[PDB]
Structure formats: structure tokens, C-alpha cells
């Protein structure tokens, strides 16, 4: 019937920074998931709670497509039970996560000579992010025993940091576009069967 607009999620021209990741809810459509699995221009395609083959046979209450940009050696953190600057302060997956983490190298799009410093990630936080929580605040982080009151300095840091993508960077430091597909269960989004 209705086509699940996965192409508009994956082939979007611009992606959000991981700190302010985008979530698109997908609903009332017939998703063809092998379009992704049967064509591997992706570097990672890890599913949790479902097997990738059986995705076209199952139905789910809702689908959420979260998208953002990180660097290669951080894709490992987009998994249940991970720790790190991304999993703790930027994008946290739950322990009972049902869905798939899809990533692919975007060096040709998100790196530029002289450096692309547009993409940001959060460096600190008072507490770790709860699953599927999002923090877009820019309060000066108080790492010390003295209030910052808006001025950066000793133990008073701006919470977000730029990535600095240059085309010459090692593959572990190159930009990677990431789409996380979360399947909410309880038949608004179904496969072709």
C-alpha cells in the first residue's frame, strides 16, 4: 500500500550531528527491508532482537529512524551495553533494543580539505544519557569545585566539541553516516508479506 520512506532517511543530503540526532517516525506503510540488506553499500548492518532475513515477514507497532554522523571507530558504540563518549553523552541504546544499526562511510560527503568542523559531539555530562534520550543544551560544563557562570576556563568547558573531518584522515577518524531503525512492538508498519 503505502511505501515506507526509507530512501528519504538514508539518502537525505544532510545528516544531523550526533548530539542533536534526528528521529523520523515511520508509520502506516509497507516496508521492504531487503532493499537495505540485499544491497550492501553499508559498512555495518547489525540487528538486535530480530534476524535481518525475517524482517519482511514481521509487523511492528511503529518504526523510528534515527540518523546522525560519527567517526568510524565510534560505530562500535552504537550497540546495547556500550560505554564511551557517544554512548554515555550522545546516543544511548537500551538493553532490550529491537532493531538494526546501519552505518556507511561518508568521507566523500562530510569531509573537506581544510577540515569540516560542522559536526559536533558532546564531551561531558553530569549523568549518562538514558536510552533514546537527547541532549541539545549548551551550558558551560562545571568540571570543578567552582561555578562557571557562563565563562569558559579552568574546569569550565563548552560541552560540545567539533569532529574535524579531513579527507586524509585514517579510516577510523573518517565520517560515517548512521541510521538506527527501532521497531516498536505490541500492525501499522509491515513487510511486503
Amino acid at each position, epitope marked *: 500500500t503505502n511505501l515506507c520512506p526509507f530512501g528519504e532517511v538514508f539518502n537525505a543530503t544532510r545528516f544531523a550531528s550526533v548530539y542533536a540526532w534526528n528521529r523520523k517516525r515511520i508509520s502506516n506503510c509497507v516496508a521492504d527491508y531487503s532493499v537495505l540488506y540485499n544491497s550492501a553499500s553499508f559498512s555495518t548492518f547489525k540487528c538486535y532482537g530480530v534476524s535481518p532475513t525475517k524482517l519482511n515477514d514481521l509487523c511492528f507497532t511503529n518504526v523510528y529512524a534515527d540518523s546522525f554522523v560519527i567517526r568510524g571507530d565510534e560505530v562500535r558504540q552504537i550497540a546495547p551495553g556500550q560505554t564511551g563518549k557517544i554512548a554515555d553523552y550522545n546516543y544511548k541504546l537500551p538493553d532490550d533494543f529491537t532493531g538494526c544499526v546501519i552505518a556507511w562511510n561518508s568521507n566523500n560527503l562530510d569531509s573537506k580539505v581544510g577540515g569540516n568542523y560542522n559536526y559536533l559531539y558532546r564531551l561531558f555530562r553530569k549523568s549518562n544519557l538514558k536510552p533514546f534520550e537527547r541532549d541539545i543544551s549548551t551550558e558551560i560544563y562545571q568540571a570543578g569545585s*567552582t561555578p562557571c557562570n557562563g*565563562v569558559e*576556563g*579552568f574546569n569550565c568547558y563548552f560541552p560540545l566539541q567539533s569532529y574535524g573531518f579531513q579527507p586524509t584522515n585514517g579510516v577510523g577518524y573518517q565520517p560515517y553516516r548512521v541510521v538506527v531503525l527501532s521497531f516498536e512492538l505490541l500492525a501499522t508498519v509491515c513487510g511486503p508479506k
Partner: antibody
Amino acid sequence: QVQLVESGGGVVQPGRSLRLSCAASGFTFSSYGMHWVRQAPGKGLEWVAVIWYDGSDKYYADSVKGRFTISRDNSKNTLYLQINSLRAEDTAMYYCAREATAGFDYWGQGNLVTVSS
Amino acid sequence: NIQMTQSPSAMSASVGDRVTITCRARQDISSYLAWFQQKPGKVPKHLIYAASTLLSGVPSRFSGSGSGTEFTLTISSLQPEDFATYYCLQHNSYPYTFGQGTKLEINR
């Protein structure tokens, strides 16, 4: 005009107690966190403790936990370090410093503490 | 305690030499490493924090570098007022830990 003047140091016998003071002026005391640092004769610097601007959170060094207590009175603009179970390892010059935007930008003059009979 | 290790523990140089002092962390401390200067008998002077950010008044010939566990202080064009003992201190996590110290004396 910003100042940190210390007092209370001197001679104490092993096991007894001593309360070190660090009086402040020339700035808003309650706006700044405060640290203690000490130095045994001819030895290196040893970070001792820190106290939040509003009292509240306090932290100590490993070789000092349980025996020393950091505190402060914001109305008297004064920082304190209480000293107990005193051993020869604690014979040192004790400095207070303030933690500011520009780092540990101001320090006390230092008061000696000589534990011995 | 994270515990910091400085190297060398002492060295000598002439006025105008450039000198590097190393400070090593047992654990990863990001870039949150400070450098102190102390002349015999006087109160310590905080020179640098966050591995490379100078404090008010500190000359630019004091340059700090490093990330993770290996940090270095490079003093260029050594001057008579620079010969002293230098300490490092991680300010990444409590309890704050100082280094063993590096005594810098003139060669003569």
C-alpha cells in the same frame, strides 16, 4: 587586594589535633572553590583536599581520608582544615589556594606544622 | 589516585637552551593536565592547565602538549627566572595527583 592569609599552624604532638585557617578578602569567597596543598621539608607537592564553593561536595587525597576534615564559613569568608591522628608524614608547609577561571590564581602564604614531642 | 610520573627528575641547562619535561599518567586523563612552577622557599605558581592553556602572566615560551597518558612541557629560550622545580598534576578526576617533580638548575 585579593588575599588569602593563613593562621593556626605551629607545633603539635603526635596523635593530637590542629585546626588550620585560611582567611579571605578582596573577592567573593562564596563564589570560589578552595583547595589545600602541602609540602614536606625537601619533598614534593602533595594535593590534600578540595571543598565546593557552597560547602557541599568535598574530596580528599588517599593518604589523608578519615583523619583530616576540610570545611569553611562563608559568612566569615574563611576556609579551615582540621587535622587529627598526626604523624611525622604530616609535618609540612600547608597552603590554601582558590580555584578560579584562571586556575589556582591566588595562594596563601603557607603555615608550618611540625609534629613532634 | 591516578598517580603521575615525571621524567627526568632533574636536569641542567644554559640560558637560551630549550628543555622538555615529560609527565606520564597511569590512566587516561583526556587532556586535563596542569603544570606548576616552584622556586625554593616560595609558593607554587600555576602555569598551565588543560595540557596547553596558559595562565595569566605565563610567558608563551612555556608550551604544553599531550593527550591521554603522555604529556610534555617544552620551555624555549630558557631565562634566569625559569630555573626552578616543575610539577605536573592531573585535574581530570578526584583525588588530584601531583608528579614527583623535575628540578631545573643552571649548567655553569
